[PDB]
Structure formats: C-alpha cells, structure tokens
Amino acid sequence: GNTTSSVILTNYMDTQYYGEIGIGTPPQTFKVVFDTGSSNVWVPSSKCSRLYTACVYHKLFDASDSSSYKHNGTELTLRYSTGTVSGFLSQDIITVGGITVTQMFGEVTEMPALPFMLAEFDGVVGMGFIEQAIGRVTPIFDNIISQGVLKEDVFSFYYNRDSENSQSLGGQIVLGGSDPQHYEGNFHYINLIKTGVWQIQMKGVSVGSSTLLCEDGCLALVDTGASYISGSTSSIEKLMEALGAKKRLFDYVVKCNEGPTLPDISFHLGGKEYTLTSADYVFQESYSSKKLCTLAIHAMDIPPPTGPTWALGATFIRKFYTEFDRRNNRIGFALAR
Ligand SMILES: Cc1c(F)cccc1Cc1c(C(=O)N2CCNCC2)c2c(C)c(O)ccc2n1-c1ccccc1
Ligand SMILES: *[C@@H]1O[C@H](CO)[C@@H](O)[C@H](O)[C@H]1NC(C)=O
Numbered sequence: 001g002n003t004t005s006s007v008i009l010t011n012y013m014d015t016q017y018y019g020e021i022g023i024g025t026p027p028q029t030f031k032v033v034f035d036t037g038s039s040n041v042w043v044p045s046s047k048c049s050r051l052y053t054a055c056v057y058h059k060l061f062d063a064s065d066s067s068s069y070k071h072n073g074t075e076l077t078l079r080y081s082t083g084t085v086s087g088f089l090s091q092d093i094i095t096v097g098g099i100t101v102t103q104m105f106g107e108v109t110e111m112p113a114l115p116f117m118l119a120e121f122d123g124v125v126g127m128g129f130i131e132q133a134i135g136r137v138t139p140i141f142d143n144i145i146s147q148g149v150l151k152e153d154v155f156s157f158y159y160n161r162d163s164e165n166s167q168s169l170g171g172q173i174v175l176g177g178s179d180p181q182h183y184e185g186n187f188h189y190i191n192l193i194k195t196g197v198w199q200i201q202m203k204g205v206s207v208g209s210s211t212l213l214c215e216d217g218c219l220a221l222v223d224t225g226a227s228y229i230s231g232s233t234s235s236i237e238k239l240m241e242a243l244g245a246k247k248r249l250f251d252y253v254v255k256c257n258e259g260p261t262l263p264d265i266s267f268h269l270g271g272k273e274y275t276l277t278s279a280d281y282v283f284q285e286s287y288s289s290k291k292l293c294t295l296a297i298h299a300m301d302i303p304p305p306t307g308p309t310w311a312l313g314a315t316f317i318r319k320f321y322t323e324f325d326r327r328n329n330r331i332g333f334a335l336a337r
Pocket of ligand 2: 071072073074089
C-alpha cells in the first residue's frame with residue numbers, strides 16, 4: 001500500500017497511554033490501550049451487570065444502536081497478569097485513525113473493580129499475534145494488513161515523558177511506518193526468538209558497574225500496555241536490594257532525597273546497551289528526606305509459555321522509540337525525542 005495512519009495518545013500520569021477507537025454505525029467511541037502484550041480487542045458491554053462498579057464508570061458498547069453489528073455470542077475469558085475479564089464475541093466495524101476494519105471483538109460482561117476501576121481506558125486493542133489470541137480470533141493488525149493499505153507491515157510507538165502539560169502530545173502510534181520527528185539516530189533491530197510473541201533474548205541486566213542479573217541470558221517481552229518495567233519476584237527483590245529500595249504491598253519506594261544518587265540500570269539487547277538513569281525510572285515527586293518516591297519498576301511473575309520474562313513497558317518506551325516489524329519479525333529501538 002501507500003498509506004500511513006497515526007493515532008494520537010493521551011498520557012495519564014506516565015502509567016496509561018490511551019487513544020480513541022470508534023465501534024459500530026453510528027460510531028460509539030472508546031478510550032483504549034494499544035497492547036503488544038495481548039492479541040484480543042475488548043470493550044465493556046451494555047449487557048454487563050451494574051453490580052460490577054467498573055461497568056458503571058466506563059463507557060459501554062450497546063449493540064442495539066449499531067446497524068453494522070453481527071452477532072456471534074461465543075463466550076471468552078481473558079486472563080491477564082493484573083486481572084481477568086469475561087464476555088462473549090461480537091462482530092462490528094472498527095475505526096482506528098482513518099482505517100476502517102470489520103473486526104471480531106469481546107463484549108465484556110464481567111469486569112472486576114480491581115484493577116479496572118483504576119483504568120482511565122475503557123477497553124484494550126491487542127497488538128500481539130494470532131498465536132496468543134484467545135479463541136483464535138484474528139487480531140486487528142492482521143485484518144489491517146489484509147486490506148493492503150499500509151506502506152510497511154510495521155507499527156510504531158512514541159510515549160511522551162511529559163504528562164502535566166497541554167499542547168505537549170501524550171504519545172503517538174504510527175500504523176505502517178515510524179515518525180522521524182520522534183526519534184534520532186538509527187534503529188537497532190533485535191530479532192524475535194519465535195513468531196507469535198513480541199519477545200526478544202536479553203543477555204544481562206547491569207546495576208551500576210556490575211552485571212548483577214540475567215547473566216547466561218533471559219527473556220524480555222516488549223509490552224506497550226505495561227506501565228512499568230517488570231521482572232520475576234526473585235530478579236526484582238534482588239535488583240531492589242542493590243538499589244536500596246523498600247518493598248511495599250504493590251510498588252517499590254525510595255527516600256526522595258536518595259533518588260538522584262541511584263545507579264544507572266542497563267539492559268543488554270542485540271549486542272547493544274539500553275541504559276536508564278535514575279531520572280528515567282524514579283517518579284521524582286520531591287527531594288524531601290521526609291517523603292517517599294516510587295520507582296517505575298515492579299515484580300510480575302508471568303506464567304509459561306510466555307514467562308518467566310522481563311517486560312519492557314512504558315518506562316522503557318518513553319526513552320526508546322519502538323518499531324514493531326511484522327514483516328521481518330523484529331523489534332527496532334531508537335533514542336526518542
Ligand atoms: C493495561 C492493560 C492492558 F493493556 C491489557 C490488559 C490489562 C491491562 C491492565 C494492566 C496490566 C496488565 O495486566 N498487562 C498484561 C497485558 N499487557 C498489558 C499489561 C499491567 C502490568 C502488567 C503492569 O506491569 C503494570 C500495570 C498494568 N495494568 C494496569 C495499568 C493501569 C491501571 C490498571 C492496570
Ligand atoms: C462465531 O465466529 C466463528 C468464526 O471463527 C465461527 O466459526 C462460529 O461458528 C461463530 N458462532 C456463531 C453463533 O455465529
């Protein structure tokens with residue numbers, strides 16, 4: 001094809017980057033996360049019981065008001081690291097930044113308050129492969145590819161650092177290419193181990209001088225939907241000990257005064273070193289000794305086949321403009337701007 005389509009994203013507190021999609025005729029609009037760590041499209045359904053408070057706060061899809069709706073009704077359960085959703089399959093017309101696709105998506109009827117009440121987004125757009133799609137439903141990007149409209153069989157992610165300003169731009173996804181306005185230098189491509197998962201080989205994690213972890217290799221899933229960089233509980237508990245961070249219920253803290261003194265964290269990928277400074281991974285809300293600052297790193301035990309793995313989420317993507325190459329089954333990284 002000849003076309004490139006861009007989706008503008010909203011940056012919510014550096015943890016959620018969401019765009020807009022339209023479903024049905026006339027379009028019903030939803031705030032969605034474009035997730036490379038999953039392959040299914042879902043939105044909350046009007047058929048969701050209002051005893052799920054998450055369904056009371058989010059925008060619901062009503063099939064009754066869509067003229068393009070095609071019923072299916074097959075049940076589906078989508079299990080994620082942070083929680084689970086259930087619903088049934090439905091078919092309709094989806095609009096993603098100028099591209100219109102006939103897509104099979106989940107109408108969510110069971111949506112727990114934890115974590116979904118914390119979500120600013122209503123639904124999810126899975127950017128993974130059909131190999132990871134629950135119910136073997138064709139993912140949205142495969143359907144866009146089938147239209148033969150895109151210049152390249154690629155998609156890119158730009159996540160902005162700045163969240164507290166307007167006119168700034170929260171982020172951007174480019175379908176069919178990369179925006180050279182948002183990166184500098186050249187892409188360094190790392191090939192995927194196998195097709196089916198946006199996962200690459202990682203050959204070490206360095207805290208300061210020493211390569212404290214992942215010597216003899218480990219895995220790294222490049223997940224656009226993950227707020228933070230994650231590792232296994234054992235890798236994390238070890239990394240956090242090295243930094244001097246204190247384990248809480250869910251997230252790790254450090255004394256705000258100690259934040260800028262923290263050592264650099266480096267990730268060995270495709271023979272290159274991808275380094276994060278303490279400015280990149282500490283939520284530096286203050287410098288007070290009497291205050292605690294959160295780190296944009298946490299533990300996540302991802303079960304097999306995918307895991308155990310590290311996950312390079314928004315924390316990593318903010319520093320490195322990421323290109324997802326479906327044609328050559330590789331991931332490209334470049335310094336973001
Ligand atoms: C963001 C997201 C998604 F895109 C698809 C499915 C589930 C989630 C929820 C969700 C996460 C999640 O389970 N996944 C798995 C599939 N790929 C995306 C990340 C998640 C992860 C793993 C984190 O390390 C940190 C926050 C997370 N949020 C989260 C963020 C903000 C508020 C509440 C939760
Ligand atoms: C739902 O869609 C799938 C497409 O893979 C089809 O094989 C199945 O029979 C459908 N069920 C209904 C009730 O339309």
